Structure 1
Amino acid sequence: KKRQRMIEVQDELLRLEPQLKQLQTKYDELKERKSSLRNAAYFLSNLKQLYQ
């Protein structure tokens, strides 16, 4: 009886790992996306007002 429980828990873990992988990739790409966007906006506004 315990053999099938072991098999199904292994299946569950193998199915659950890649979702965590993809979520981590999305998170640590969106963070740097937002940071770069903010930096670019700041620099652009600064140079615009400077030339103005």
Structure 2
Amino acid sequence: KKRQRMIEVQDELLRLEPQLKQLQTKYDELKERKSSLRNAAYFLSNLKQLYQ
């Protein structure tokens, strides 16, 4: 029964292992996108003010 328990715990571990990676990279890329777009909005507004 402990050997079966090995089977399910290892299966759960190997299933959950990849799940972290895509979520981590998605969080990182969305945070970078948010920062970049906020900066870009700031610069476009500021340059529009300069032009006006």
Report how many residues are paired.
Answer: 52
TM-score, length basis structure 2: 0.93
* Stretches (4+) displaced over 6 A: none
Q: Which sections of structure 2, spanning at least 5 residues, go unmatched? A: none
Deviations 1:1-52 (A, max 9, x none): 1111011100000001111111101100000000000000000100001110
- Distance of 1:17 and 1:33 partners within structure 2: 26
Identity across the alignment (%): 100
Q: Which sections of structure 1, spanning at least 5 residues, go unmatched? A: none
